[PDB]
């Protein structure tokens, strides 16, 4: 970790620990994609491309020696910067419990949006295809609370006709869930009725999408490949403040498209 020049910054260990503890808390709750996909362990700060497993033929027809080239996926690297104030940071040694750290939090939120955008909608220049692009896995639904229960029962049959098993999960918007909750009138609780038709599943509410989808959790269908995880480092100094940055390197892919169903309201 020597490429992050952390020992040339005028701070103490307590101040570094205070800065490190606050970002982990927000990253733990605002990264929504990492709750139902797989992660492949880090490879290092020198990894560059990931193989696909094919050949493209570039020679002509009547030649004696024939040749081609192999194919892969490139990785993405990012960086974002911010500033902090030294006299304000210096009261932690006199014994203040609460210190102002708002710019750090704002930058963390804007970084956390960037990865979910790629996981859900893909990147054109890199050659990545997202979860909402497979438009041969669609099912119509309605707005009454019983249409949802009918649609879940219909979807499990399509899952079983292909040989797919395992625990199942539902991912849905938030305003639609609130409307469903308000529609019912003092009946049996709706969350238990929903979890009975998934044979003991879960529910996840998010602001990233606009409709609902259903997935299976046996393992090995969506992969996120990491080279280096999220890290903080030091840049320079300007007369009363310091400048720091955040960085990461990754890519993503989908293997079996048969473990996914989309609902259209």
Ligand X SMILES: Cc1cc2nc3c(=O)[nH]c(=O)nc-3n(C[C@H](O)[C@H](O)[C@H](O)CO)c2cc1C
Task: State yes or no: 235 annotated in a binding site.
Answer: yes
Binding mask 227-256 for ligand X (x = CB under 6 A): --------x---------------------
**Smallest distance from the beta carbon of 14 to ligand X, in angstroms?**
14
From ligand X, a copy of itself, none, interface partner of 41 (C-beta below 5 to 8 A by class): none
Binding mask 86-125 for ligand X (x = CB under 6 A): xx--x-----------------------------------
Contact criterion met (CB below 8 Å) for 64 and 51: no
Return all residues near 235 (Cβ < 8 A) that are at least 6 apart: 81, 243, 244, 245
Which residue lies nearer to ligand X by CB, 68 or 142?
Answer: 68
Q: Which stretch binds a copy of itself (CB under 8 A): 34-42, 94-102, 131-139, 209-217?
A: 94-102
H-only helix segments in 139-189: 145-161, 175-183
Contact criterion met (CB below 8 Å) for 35 and 16: no
Contact criterion met (CB below 8 Å) for 252 and 128: yes
**Smallest distance from the beta carbon of 154 to ligand X, in angstroms?**
42
Q: Which stretch binds a copy of itself (CB under 8 A): 28-36, 133-141, 208-216?
A: 28-36
Which residue lies nearer to ligand X by CB, 10 or 257?
Answer: 10
Asked if 75 interacts with a copy of itself (CB under 8 A), we say yes
Spatial separation of the C-alpha atoms in residues 178 and 143, rounded to whole Å: 12
Spatial separation of the C-alpha atoms in residues 221 and 218, rounded to whole Å: 9
Asked if 203 interacts with a copy of itself (CB under 8 A), we say no
Spatial separation of the C-alpha atoms in residues 110 and 106, rounded to whole Å: 6
From a copy of itself, ligand X, none, interface partner of 87 (C-beta below 5 to 8 A by class): ligand X
> Residue 249 has which token pair?
């390197």
Contact criterion met (CB below 8 Å) for 6 and 233: yes
Helix (H, G, I), strand (E, B) or coil at 265: coil
Task: State yes or no: 93 annotated in a binding site.
Answer: yes
**First and final C-alpha spacing in the chain:** 49
* Binding-site member from 40, 77, 100, 210 for a copy of itself (CB under 8 A): 77
Q: Which residues of the chain form contacts with ligand X (CB under 6 A)? A: 55, 57, 66, 68, 77, 79, 81, 86-87, 90, 235
């Amino acid at each position: 970790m020597e490429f992050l020049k952390r020992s040339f910054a005028p701070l103490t260990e307590k101040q570094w620990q205070e800065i490190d503890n606050r970002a982990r808390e927000i990253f733990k709750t605002q990264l929504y994609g990492r709750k139902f996909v797989d992660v492949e362990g880090p490879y290092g700060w020198e990894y560059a491309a990931h193989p696909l497993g094919e050949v493209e033929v570039l020679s002509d027809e009547n030649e004696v020696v024939k040749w081609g080239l192999r194919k892969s996926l490139p990785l993405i690297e990012l960086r974002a910067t911010f500033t902090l104030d030294l006299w304000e940071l210096d009261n932690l040694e006199r014994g203040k419990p609460n210190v102002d750290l708002s710019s750090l939090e704002e930058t963390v939120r804007k970084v956390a949006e960037f990865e979910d955008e790629v996981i859900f909608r893909g990147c054109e220049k890199s050659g990545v295809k997202g979860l909402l692009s497979f438009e041969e896995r669609k099912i119509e639904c309605g707005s009454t609370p019983k249409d949802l229960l009918e649609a879940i029962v219909r979807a499990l049959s399509i899952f079983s006709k292909d040989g797919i098993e395992g625990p199942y999960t539902l991912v849905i918007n938030t305003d639609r869930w609130i409307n469903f909750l308000k529609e019912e009138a003092g009946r049996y609780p709706l969350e238990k009725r929903v979890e009975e038709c998934l044979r003991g599943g879960k529910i996840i509410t998010t602001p990233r999408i606009e409709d609902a989808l259903v997935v299976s959790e046996r393992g090995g269908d969506f992969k996120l490949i990491l080279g280096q995880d999220l890290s903080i480092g030091y840049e320079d100094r300007e007369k009363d403040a310091v400048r720091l940055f955040i960085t990461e390197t990754f890519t993503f892919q989908v293997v079996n498209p048969e473990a996914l169903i989309l609902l259209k309201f």
